[PDB]
């Protein structure tokens, strides 16, 4: 017998289609190769990143713990599996007791002493109604869930390394931009100084030009720190140093990622690890019900042994000293003060908690993918508008610089043009990083980088 | 007889009144109808949000798990409650053993057998010193805490739905403002294009107008994304999709919330689910000391049954095969190597941990309410100043535009007027959102979100 | 007899020296007086902060819980140390059973009886192969780890208080600066208002002047709130209100801290609490392997008592009613269906998990110090540039101010000079706050403020 309820997977408490609106491109429906099946070696096209991810898959300590957890849960299933077989061992025994005359059969105080060397088992529970099998099946699903928890932890690490790599790259572009802009402001300042001395440029013009130089200089120190701090964060995720022999990497103006299909929401239920992790834990709670039910039914037990017993230690292995035992037992609960019902009620509550947790897991994934798809349908337009802002601002600066040196306009115009171009360029870099980070997280949200190659 | 110490609620380690100063309006004193007693249907005035909150209460999976934990702790209480009663069951027994001559009775090797079927209890602990009663009282108290934790989980969710709805509402208003602003920027640019074509407007004027357009173009795509992502976040909190027959919502310029009276700091100890939760945990720890003390006192046990016994399985239920057993036991510990007092010390340490946690819960609650009252006394003036800025910026915009089209001054004044107005209008939307959400959290901070209608 | 494997401390999986580059000062080397040994009384120069940290060390509830946790884990060590010694108690027992004809000694239905009041030990496990000692040593090292966790709890509190204090101080400077700036803008606006009524200032000049005032009015309301809420965040950390008679505090522009040496990364291995905490947890898991190994070896148990026994209750403490029992046992497991191997595998897996967690603690500590040195090597430059910017903006505002009211220039240039200076000054305060925070957090990363005076 097995009293585990028959398992049926809850229905997905989300929409059948991903959201539509001004922010969303057209829904593309089912895909033959879902994002989860696409390798990170395929998804990430930067060969420097591909190597960094490989270093991290081997040296990161968090993912190392995740791997060892699976092992630890397998071990706990191996214990629960062994509870079904008899614990057989050797039992050496000694007894020596003085008893009063009203207890000893002879009628006067006496010492009764006995010894034994026996081989067999003690309190071996026979699993007729599947109490121990249910607990084994609970322990098996918990292991299975931990295996998916590992796969989820890798998809987290992959996305983390990618984001950290791309942040360092964006901040390295911010830094080089500031160096070039400082040098340009400095050169511009030197002409203004030169003009001031000869009495053409005013004192105001000079201090305005001074403001542009000191601002850029303060910005230079910030990104110098941010770059270093981005390096430190990358090293931590790798679990070791940045390798020396790194392949030439790609630039932020190149296509760094492969475009990944959204698929259908229902794809998540078979592909996304932390949804499958939660399902396996729901299956584990279902199995535990079968153990709480078998508590109502008779509990069969057996104690048996064979060996040698004697009244004196020396007379143990002598002839005519053999001994065996057969001690079966059955126990059926009649009256518990509502105790067994509460234990079944409890296991039933634990299943419903797991239903809800599994459902929340689905609803979370839907939200995360939908967010990624809103970035996909808006960042191309935004980047293009920012590119056009940079292009217009540059033309604006060139005319402004020309009209100041000529004496047609004030320095305030050139100052406005200096700031506007510089803030627009810094922004383009940030926007590009946000678009790429969003794409990387969408990949993770669909099933991530568990596979190195495509399945 | 129980050995549970008397309970005394620790003093509230906060000030008797809420803070005063520049950021705080005058304290309101005692509240006739405390915030906790006021319904979210009374607090929230938007009928659409009210409906949406109702949808979240039935569908949100986090709150659902919270509702189930209460039942799981109730069941655990019911288990501990039952263990004060004797467990009555049916025991079937068997014993077949070979014994050598010197251990047997007969003086010669023999096989003795006995069989029994009986009805009764095994090792029933007579709770004389209240060890099991203490463990039941600990369990009941943990259940009572878990009930309070459900109320706290609801006050959180209500605040989360309100914030996610108000956030969406603001970003929608941002989106529309950006759409309108781009429209006026596009017209202005086209007027400049024509003016340049006749030789009035300069090339600089035209490119200044262009940077204004492309900048709004990038803001439009950002708010288009933000709006969509704000909807995804709300749907996750609801636990389902947005309903189809929702009533008309209210605008952000209208009165949205029924501002809640603060009351006195002491109201928190009676009404905030967070604090009441930590008190029940304290009372639960207090009860564990009763079970640790009881271990020093005599332990009373009983094994008692009645039924049938026989040398042969065939003779079990026959006439004259009747049997009973009465086997009471008492154990009083004398030497434990310090085990028992260490267990008691541990029990006493846990209560101190829980006292310290109870006090922190009150200190944290004071901090949250006070921050909410710092916002209340400052946001009135901040929004008045931001409104006045917007009005002044609109007048500044119109004069500068009028002055540019006439040729009496440059385009830089108009560009500056355009940016100041747009920046100021965006910021007003954000300030209103910061103000509203501070009020929403103030309501939760006093423990408000539990009742639908005012009690 | 102990089966605990030899403890070898894993090698540091970090670089032999802290990073170098554009953002870093030269590596100073090994320090005579390490950062961990510097007292917080020495490190924090501000006497108002020293009184506050003292208040927090005795009133903060989370540090109270952390110190009580040490007592709880110590009590847990004592409980398991006691399991090595025999539990001696007084055991009183009764027995009364009816036996049917075939089972009785008389051949007919008889009632047997047995009583006894005794003093002894039941089931005493003689720790021959060190199973119980391994469990005791496991519990010891978890106590030793909790002792280190308390030390980490303090260094965290010390940093949190210092940061909270500095943040309130920086926001007090932001508020004061805004009061000064608002008065300057209002003065300026009024003089424009007087110049407007006389047909010298235009309607454009006046509205520009107005926007500045309303803008400054809104920032005032904001900083009034942030100061209030910053006080509230500090009170929570103190576990108590702010004292009225505090010592005189130093301003943000003073020398507030002593320069703490970085040392070598290999200092952290001996001097950082949470790294040492991780090491004891690893050591504790190493000891648990000794208890898993000793499950394969013989298990000795001993039951021994002395007292009085009788057939009747009345003849208990009578002459010749004395009794004793001596019952040695030895168990050796032979067949387990892999059970003991799985339990040994589990212990070994847990040790491997603690190795990875110990290696991660070192890698994490490396990141935090390296980021702290990157802040050290860049903030001097940033703040120098920002100070020079403030000065240049100051000269700029003064020139722009006179140039307007003399009729030489227009208000827009004055307006822009006002924005630049006010923004410049606000950013200088923020950069000062962040420079100081980084130094505060660096001190904590190296091993923090456990010692009051320098060691
Ligand atoms: Cl309102
Ligand atoms: Na789709
Ligand atoms: Na970092
Ligand atoms: Na999920
Ligand atoms: Na409302
Ligand atoms: Na709950
Ligand atoms: Na949406
Ligand atoms: Na505008
Ligand atoms: Na309700
Ligand atoms: Na100290």
PDB file of N, CA and C in Angstrom, chain C residues 147-227:
ATOM      1  N   UNK C 147      30.629  33.891  19.091  1.00  0.00           N
ATOM      2  CA  UNK C 147      31.433  34.911  19.764  1.00  0.00           C
ATOM      3  C   UNK C 147      32.039  35.892  18.753  1.00  0.00           C
ATOM      4  N   UNK C 148      32.508  35.372  17.619  1.00  0.00           N
ATOM      5  CA  UNK C 148      33.033  36.221  16.545  1.00  0.00           C
ATOM      6  C   UNK C 148      31.936  37.040  15.855  1.00  0.00           C
ATOM      7  N   UNK C 149      30.761  36.429  15.677  1.00  0.00           N
ATOM      8  CA  UNK C 149      29.606  37.095  15.068  1.00  0.00           C
ATOM      9  C   UNK C 149      29.133  38.293  15.887  1.00  0.00           C
ATOM     10  N   UNK C 150      29.289  38.204  17.210  1.00  0.00           N
ATOM     11  CA  UNK C 150      29.016  39.323  18.109  1.00  0.00           C
ATOM     12  C   UNK C 150      29.998  40.464  17.844  1.00  0.00           C
ATOM     13  N   UNK C 151      31.267  40.121  17.638  1.00  0.00           N
ATOM     14  CA  UNK C 151      32.295  41.120  17.334  1.00  0.00           C
ATOM     15  C   UNK C 151      32.056  41.808  15.989  1.00  0.00           C
ATOM     16  N   UNK C 152      31.498  41.066  15.036  1.00  0.00           N
ATOM     17  CA  UNK C 152      31.139  41.621  13.736  1.00  0.00           C
ATOM     18  C   UNK C 152      29.890  42.487  13.850  1.00  0.00           C
ATOM     19  N   UNK C 153      28.970  42.088  14.722  1.00  0.00           N
ATOM     20  CA  UNK C 153      27.761  42.866  15.000  1.00  0.00           C
ATOM     21  C   UNK C 153      28.078  44.264  15.526  1.00  0.00           C
ATOM     22  N   UNK C 154      29.078  44.362  16.401  1.00  0.00           N
ATOM     23  CA  UNK C 154      29.512  45.650  16.945  1.00  0.00           C
ATOM     24  C   UNK C 154      30.119  46.555  15.875  1.00  0.00           C
ATOM     25  N   UNK C 155      31.086  46.031  15.122  1.00  0.00           N
ATOM     26  CA  UNK C 155      31.758  46.804  14.069  1.00  0.00           C
ATOM     27  C   UNK C 155      30.763  47.320  13.028  1.00  0.00           C
ATOM     28  N   UNK C 156      29.686  46.565  12.825  1.00  0.00           N
ATOM     29  CA  UNK C 156      28.612  46.971  11.926  1.00  0.00           C
ATOM     30  C   UNK C 156      27.815  48.116  12.537  1.00  0.00           C
ATOM     31  N   UNK C 157      27.495  47.992  13.824  1.00  0.00           N
ATOM     32  CA  UNK C 157      26.775  49.043  14.550  1.00  0.00           C
ATOM     33  C   UNK C 157      27.574  50.339  14.610  1.00  0.00           C
ATOM     34  N   UNK C 158      28.855  50.224  14.958  1.00  0.00           N
ATOM     35  CA  UNK C 158      29.765  51.376  15.039  1.00  0.00           C
ATOM     36  C   UNK C 158      29.800  52.176  13.727  1.00  0.00           C
ATOM     37  N   UNK C 159      29.871  51.461  12.603  1.00  0.00           N
ATOM     38  CA  UNK C 159      29.864  52.062  11.266  1.00  0.00           C
ATOM     39  C   UNK C 159      28.517  52.693  10.916  1.00  0.00           C
ATOM     40  N   UNK C 160      27.433  52.001  11.265  1.00  0.00           N
ATOM     41  CA  UNK C 160      26.065  52.477  11.025  1.00  0.00           C
ATOM     42  C   UNK C 160      25.750  53.769  11.765  1.00  0.00           C
ATOM     43  N   UNK C 161      26.173  53.845  13.030  1.00  0.00           N
ATOM     44  CA  UNK C 161      25.993  55.044  13.855  1.00  0.00           C
ATOM     45  C   UNK C 161      26.795  56.210  13.279  1.00  0.00           C
ATOM     46  N   UNK C 162      28.072  55.959  12.992  1.00  0.00           N
ATOM     47  CA  UNK C 162      28.963  56.954  12.387  1.00  0.00           C
ATOM     48  C   UNK C 162      28.399  57.509  11.083  1.00  0.00           C
ATOM     49  N   UNK C 163      27.912  56.618  10.215  1.00  0.00           N
ATOM     50  CA  UNK C 163      27.285  57.001   8.941  1.00  0.00           C
ATOM     51  C   UNK C 163      25.995  57.800   9.162  1.00  0.00           C
ATOM     52  N   UNK C 164      25.140  57.323  10.062  1.00  0.00           N
ATOM     53  CA  UNK C 164      23.909  58.042  10.406  1.00  0.00           C
ATOM     54  C   UNK C 164      24.195  59.446  10.935  1.00  0.00           C
ATOM     55  N   UNK C 165      25.205  59.557  11.798  1.00  0.00           N
ATOM     56  CA  UNK C 165      25.616  60.838  12.374  1.00  0.00           C
ATOM     57  C   UNK C 165      26.121  61.802  11.304  1.00  0.00           C
ATOM     58  N   UNK C 166      26.956  61.297  10.396  1.00  0.00           N
ATOM     59  CA  UNK C 166      27.513  62.113   9.319  1.00  0.00           C
ATOM     60  C   UNK C 166      26.456  62.558   8.314  1.00  0.00           C
ATOM     61  N   UNK C 167      25.515  61.662   8.010  1.00  0.00           N
ATOM     62  CA  UNK C 167      24.405  61.958   7.099  1.00  0.00           C
ATOM     63  C   UNK C 167      23.519  63.082   7.625  1.00  0.00           C
ATOM     64  N   UNK C 168      23.172  63.019   8.910  1.00  0.00           N
ATOM     65  CA  UNK C 168      22.422  64.096   9.571  1.00  0.00           C
ATOM     66  C   UNK C 168      23.223  65.400   9.548  1.00  0.00           C
ATOM     67  N   UNK C 169      24.489  65.339   9.837  1.00  0.00           N
ATOM     68  CA  UNK C 169      25.366  66.466   9.750  1.00  0.00           C
ATOM     69  C   UNK C 169      25.512  67.086   8.349  1.00  0.00           C
ATOM     70  N   UNK C 170      25.604  66.250   7.330  1.00  0.00           N
ATOM     71  CA  UNK C 170      25.637  66.703   5.935  1.00  0.00           C
ATOM     72  C   UNK C 170      24.322  67.331   5.494  1.00  0.00           C
ATOM     73  N   UNK C 171      23.208  66.763   5.947  1.00  0.00           N
ATOM     74  CA  UNK C 171      21.891  67.328   5.647  1.00  0.00           C
ATOM     75  C   UNK C 171      21.604  68.608   6.425  1.00  0.00           C
ATOM     76  N   UNK C 172      22.219  68.748   7.598  1.00  0.00           N
ATOM     77  CA  UNK C 172      22.158  70.009   8.349  1.00  0.00           C
ATOM     78  C   UNK C 172      22.924  71.131   7.637  1.00  0.00           C
ATOM     79  N   UNK C 173      24.011  70.767   6.959  1.00  0.00           N
ATOM     80  CA  UNK C 173      24.769  71.710   6.133  1.00  0.00           C
ATOM     81  C   UNK C 173      24.024  72.060   4.846  1.00  0.00           C
ATOM     82  N   UNK C 174      23.290  71.095   4.290  1.00  0.00           N
ATOM     83  CA  UNK C 174      22.464  71.327   3.095  1.00  0.00           C
ATOM     84  C   UNK C 174      21.316  72.283   3.416  1.00  0.00           C
ATOM     85  N   UNK C 175      20.694  72.087   4.577  1.00  0.00           N
ATOM     86  CA  UNK C 175      19.592  72.940   5.032  1.00  0.00           C
ATOM     87  C   UNK C 175      20.050  74.367   5.331  1.00  0.00           C
ATOM     88  N   UNK C 176      21.171  74.494   6.042  1.00  0.00           N
ATOM     89  CA  UNK C 176      21.726  75.802   6.385  1.00  0.00           C
ATOM     90  C   UNK C 176      22.098  76.593   5.131  1.00  0.00           C
ATOM     91  N   UNK C 177      22.786  75.927   4.203  1.00  0.00           N
ATOM     92  CA  UNK C 177      23.159  76.512   2.918  1.00  0.00           C
ATOM     93  C   UNK C 177      21.939  76.987   2.116  1.00  0.00           C
ATOM     94  N   UNK C 178      20.845  76.228   2.184  1.00  0.00           N
ATOM     95  CA  UNK C 178      19.606  76.585   1.482  1.00  0.00           C
ATOM     96  C   UNK C 178      18.921  77.818   2.098  1.00  0.00           C
ATOM     97  N   UNK C 179      18.970  77.942   3.425  1.00  0.00           N
ATOM     98  CA  UNK C 179      18.471  79.146   4.108  1.00  0.00           C
ATOM     99  C   UNK C 179      19.236  80.387   3.648  1.00  0.00           C
ATOM    100  N   UNK C 180      20.561  80.270   3.600  1.00  0.00           N
ATOM    101  CA  UNK C 180      21.416  81.364   3.130  1.00  0.00           C
ATOM    102  C   UNK C 180      21.122  81.740   1.682  1.00  0.00           C
ATOM    103  N   UNK C 181      21.021  80.725   0.823  1.00  0.00           N
ATOM    104  CA  UNK C 181      20.734  80.913  -0.604  1.00  0.00           C
ATOM    105  C   UNK C 181      19.333  81.503  -0.859  1.00  0.00           C
ATOM    106  N   UNK C 182      18.324  81.042  -0.115  1.00  0.00           N
ATOM    107  CA  UNK C 182      16.961  81.590  -0.231  1.00  0.00           C
ATOM    108  C   UNK C 182      16.874  83.082   0.120  1.00  0.00           C
ATOM    109  N   UNK C 183      17.603  83.493   1.157  1.00  0.00           N
ATOM    110  CA  UNK C 183      17.652  84.893   1.572  1.00  0.00           C
ATOM    111  C   UNK C 183      18.324  85.762   0.527  1.00  0.00           C
ATOM    112  N   UNK C 184      19.386  85.227  -0.075  1.00  0.00           N
ATOM    113  CA  UNK C 184      20.130  85.897  -1.144  1.00  0.00           C
ATOM    114  C   UNK C 184      19.279  86.055  -2.410  1.00  0.00           C
ATOM    115  N   UNK C 185      18.473  85.037  -2.722  1.00  0.00           N
ATOM    116  CA  UNK C 185      17.578  85.082  -3.880  1.00  0.00           C
ATOM    117  C   UNK C 185      16.424  86.045  -3.658  1.00  0.00           C
ATOM    118  N   UNK C 186      15.921  86.095  -2.425  1.00  0.00           N
ATOM    119  CA  UNK C 186      14.802  86.970  -2.080  1.00  0.00           C
ATOM    120  C   UNK C 186      15.233  88.436  -2.090  1.00  0.00           C
ATOM    121  N   UNK C 187      16.402  88.709  -1.511  1.00  0.00           N
ATOM    122  CA  UNK C 187      17.032  90.024  -1.602  1.00  0.00           C
ATOM    123  C   UNK C 187      17.141  90.454  -3.067  1.00  0.00           C
ATOM    124  N   UNK C 188      17.733  89.589  -3.890  1.00  0.00           N
ATOM    125  CA  UNK C 188      17.894  89.829  -5.327  1.00  0.00           C
ATOM    126  C   UNK C 188      16.563  90.084  -6.046  1.00  0.00           C
ATOM    127  N   UNK C 189      15.562  89.247  -5.767  1.00  0.00           N
ATOM    128  CA  UNK C 189      14.222  89.395  -6.347  1.00  0.00           C
ATOM    129  C   UNK C 189      13.586  90.749  -6.023  1.00  0.00           C
ATOM    130  N   UNK C 190      13.688  91.167  -4.762  1.00  0.00           N
ATOM    131  CA  UNK C 190      13.118  92.437  -4.309  1.00  0.00           C
ATOM    132  C   UNK C 190      13.753  93.650  -5.001  1.00  0.00           C
ATOM    133  N   UNK C 191      15.079  93.636  -5.143  1.00  0.00           N
ATOM    134  CA  UNK C 191      15.798  94.698  -5.864  1.00  0.00           C
ATOM    135  C   UNK C 191      15.449  94.753  -7.353  1.00  0.00           C
ATOM    136  N   UNK C 192      15.114  93.597  -7.929  1.00  0.00           N
ATOM    137  CA  UNK C 192      14.593  93.524  -9.294  1.00  0.00           C
ATOM    138  C   UNK C 192      13.165  94.071  -9.326  1.00  0.00           C
ATOM    139  N   UNK C 193      12.382  93.748  -8.298  1.00  0.00           N
ATOM    140  CA  UNK C 193      11.018  94.262  -8.154  1.00  0.00           C
ATOM    141  C   UNK C 193      10.979  95.797  -8.070  1.00  0.00           C
ATOM    142  N   UNK C 194      11.962  96.377  -7.382  1.00  0.00           N
ATOM    143  CA  UNK C 194      12.105  97.832  -7.291  1.00  0.00           C
ATOM    144  C   UNK C 194      12.562  98.415  -8.628  1.00  0.00           C
ATOM    145  N   UNK C 195      13.464  97.702  -9.299  1.00  0.00           N
ATOM    146  CA  UNK C 195      13.957  98.081 -10.624  1.00  0.00           C
ATOM    147  C   UNK C 195      12.909  97.893 -11.720  1.00  0.00           C
ATOM    148  N   UNK C 196      11.925  97.027 -11.470  1.00  0.00           N
ATOM    149  CA  UNK C 196      10.850  96.777 -12.434  1.00  0.00           C
ATOM    150  C   UNK C 196       9.810  97.893 -12.437  1.00  0.00           C
ATOM    151  N   UNK C 197       9.458  98.371 -11.245  1.00  0.00           N
ATOM    152  CA  UNK C 197       8.434  99.405 -11.086  1.00  0.00           C
ATOM    153  C   UNK C 197       8.861 100.739 -11.703  1.00  0.00           C
ATOM    154  N   UNK C 198      10.156 100.858 -11.993  1.00  0.00           N
ATOM    155  CA  UNK C 198      10.733 102.081 -12.549  1.00  0.00           C
ATOM    156  C   UNK C 198      11.126 101.909 -14.029  1.00  0.00           C
ATOM    157  N   UNK C 199      10.624 100.844 -14.650  1.00  0.00           N
ATOM    158  CA  UNK C 199      10.816 100.604 -16.080  1.00  0.00           C
ATOM    159  C   UNK C 199      12.252 100.352 -16.515  1.00  0.00           C
ATOM    160  N   UNK C 200      13.059  99.805 -15.607  1.00  0.00           N
ATOM    161  CA  UNK C 200      14.448  99.441 -15.912  1.00  0.00           C
ATOM    162  C   UNK C 200      14.564  97.931 -16.101  1.00  0.00           C
ATOM    163  N   UNK C 201      13.998  97.178 -15.158  1.00  0.00           N
ATOM    164  CA  UNK C 201      13.904  95.724 -15.264  1.00  0.00           C
ATOM    165  C   UNK C 201      12.656  95.338 -16.056  1.00  0.00           C
ATOM    166  N   UNK C 202      12.786  94.320 -16.904  1.00  0.00           N
ATOM    167  CA  UNK C 202      11.667  93.848 -17.719  1.00  0.00           C
ATOM    168  C   UNK C 202      10.801  92.835 -16.968  1.00  0.00           C
ATOM    169  N   UNK C 203       9.673  92.463 -17.569  1.00  0.00           N
ATOM    170  CA  UNK C 203       8.799  91.432 -17.011  1.00  0.00           C
ATOM    171  C   UNK C 203       9.491  90.068 -17.014  1.00  0.00           C
ATOM    172  N   UNK C 204      10.383  89.875 -17.984  1.00  0.00           N
ATOM    173  CA  UNK C 204      11.177  88.657 -18.117  1.00  0.00           C
ATOM    174  C   UNK C 204      12.184  88.521 -16.973  1.00  0.00           C
ATOM    175  N   UNK C 205      12.862  89.622 -16.653  1.00  0.00           N
ATOM    176  CA  UNK C 205      13.844  89.667 -15.565  1.00  0.00           C
ATOM    177  C   UNK C 205      13.231  89.279 -14.225  1.00  0.00           C
ATOM    178  N   UNK C 206      11.991  89.706 -14.013  1.00  0.00           N
ATOM    179  CA  UNK C 206      11.293  89.517 -12.748  1.00  0.00           C
ATOM    180  C   UNK C 206      10.815  88.078 -12.554  1.00  0.00           C
ATOM    181  N   UNK C 207      10.298  87.477 -13.625  1.00  0.00           N
ATOM    182  CA  UNK C 207       9.826  86.097 -13.587  1.00  0.00           C
ATOM    183  C   UNK C 207      10.982  85.108 -13.441  1.00  0.00           C
ATOM    184  N   UNK C 208      12.112  85.412 -14.081  1.00  0.00           N
ATOM    185  CA  UNK C 208      13.348  84.646 -13.901  1.00  0.00           C
ATOM    186  C   UNK C 208      13.799  84.684 -12.445  1.00  0.00           C
ATOM    187  N   UNK C 209      13.806  85.889 -11.873  1.00  0.00           N
ATOM    188  CA  UNK C 209      14.154  86.111 -10.471  1.00  0.00           C
ATOM    189  C   UNK C 209      13.226  85.336  -9.546  1.00  0.00           C
ATOM    190  N   UNK C 210      11.954  85.268  -9.937  1.00  0.00           N
ATOM    191  CA  UNK C 210      10.924  84.565  -9.187  1.00  0.00           C
ATOM    192  C   UNK C 210      11.149  83.051  -9.168  1.00  0.00           C
ATOM    193  N   UNK C 211      11.376  82.456 -10.340  1.00  0.00           N
ATOM    194  CA  UNK C 211      11.570  81.002 -10.446  1.00  0.00           C
ATOM    195  C   UNK C 211      12.641  80.513  -9.478  1.00  0.00           C
ATOM    196  N   UNK C 212      13.746  81.255  -9.406  1.00  0.00           N
ATOM    197  CA  UNK C 212      14.857  80.961  -8.498  1.00  0.00           C
ATOM    198  C   UNK C 212      14.416  80.883  -7.030  1.00  0.00           C
ATOM    199  N   UNK C 213      13.578  81.829  -6.608  1.00  0.00           N
ATOM    200  CA  UNK C 213      13.078  81.875  -5.230  1.00  0.00           C
ATOM    201  C   UNK C 213      12.195  80.665  -4.899  1.00  0.00           C
ATOM    202  N   UNK C 214      11.246  80.369  -5.784  1.00  0.00           N
ATOM    203  CA  UNK C 214      10.347  79.226  -5.629  1.00  0.00           C
ATOM    204  C   UNK C 214      11.103  77.896  -5.671  1.00  0.00           C
ATOM    205  N   UNK C 215      12.147  77.835  -6.497  1.00  0.00           N
ATOM    206  CA  UNK C 215      13.002  76.654  -6.577  1.00  0.00           C
ATOM    207  C   UNK C 215      13.739  76.421  -5.274  1.00  0.00           C
ATOM    208  N   UNK C 216      14.291  77.497  -4.714  1.00  0.00           N
ATOM    209  CA  UNK C 216      15.003  77.460  -3.432  1.00  0.00           C
ATOM    210  C   UNK C 216      14.081  77.166  -2.252  1.00  0.00           C
ATOM    211  N   UNK C 217      12.818  77.561  -2.383  1.00  0.00           N
ATOM    212  CA  UNK C 217      11.800  77.353  -1.354  1.00  0.00           C
ATOM    213  C   UNK C 217      11.416  75.874  -1.248  1.00  0.00           C
ATOM    214  N   UNK C 218      11.438  75.180  -2.386  1.00  0.00           N
ATOM    215  CA  UNK C 218      11.081  73.767  -2.447  1.00  0.00           C
ATOM    216  C   UNK C 218      12.204  72.869  -1.929  1.00  0.00           C
ATOM    217  N   UNK C 219      13.447  73.293  -2.131  1.00  0.00           N
ATOM    218  CA  UNK C 219      14.609  72.562  -1.626  1.00  0.00           C
ATOM    219  C   UNK C 219      14.713  72.699  -0.113  1.00  0.00           C
ATOM    220  N   UNK C 220      14.326  73.870   0.397  1.00  0.00           N
ATOM    221  CA  UNK C 220      14.278  74.128   1.840  1.00  0.00           C
ATOM    222  C   UNK C 220      13.343  73.154   2.562  1.00  0.00           C
ATOM    223  N   UNK C 221      12.123  73.024   2.047  1.00  0.00           N
ATOM    224  CA  UNK C 221      11.125  72.096   2.588  1.00  0.00           C
ATOM    225  C   UNK C 221      11.618  70.648   2.577  1.00  0.00           C
ATOM    226  N   UNK C 222      12.290  70.268   1.493  1.00  0.00           N
ATOM    227  CA  UNK C 222      12.891  68.943   1.348  1.00  0.00           C
ATOM    228  C   UNK C 222      13.996  68.653   2.378  1.00  0.00           C
ATOM    229  N   UNK C 223      14.962  69.560   2.520  1.00  0.00           N
ATOM    230  CA  UNK C 223      16.044  69.366   3.498  1.00  0.00           C
ATOM    231  C   UNK C 223      15.568  69.440   4.952  1.00  0.00           C
ATOM    232  N   UNK C 224      14.515  70.216   5.213  1.00  0.00           N
ATOM    233  CA  UNK C 224      13.859  70.219   6.528  1.00  0.00           C
ATOM    234  C   UNK C 224      13.351  68.811   6.885  1.00  0.00           C
ATOM    235  N   UNK C 225      12.739  68.134   5.910  1.00  0.00           N
ATOM    236  CA  UNK C 225      12.276  66.749   6.066  1.00  0.00           C
ATOM    237  C   UNK C 225      13.434  65.769   6.236  1.00  0.00           C
ATOM    238  N   UNK C 226      14.433  65.867   5.357  1.00  0.00           N
ATOM    239  CA  UNK C 226      15.580  64.948   5.382  1.00  0.00           C
ATOM    240  C   UNK C 226      16.372  65.035   6.681  1.00  0.00           C
ATOM    241  N   UNK C 227      16.481  66.233   7.250  1.00  0.00           N
ATOM    242  CA  UNK C 227      17.109  66.401   8.569  1.00  0.00           C
ATOM    243  C   UNK C 227      16.276  65.702   9.655  1.00  0.00           C
TER     244      UNK C 227
END
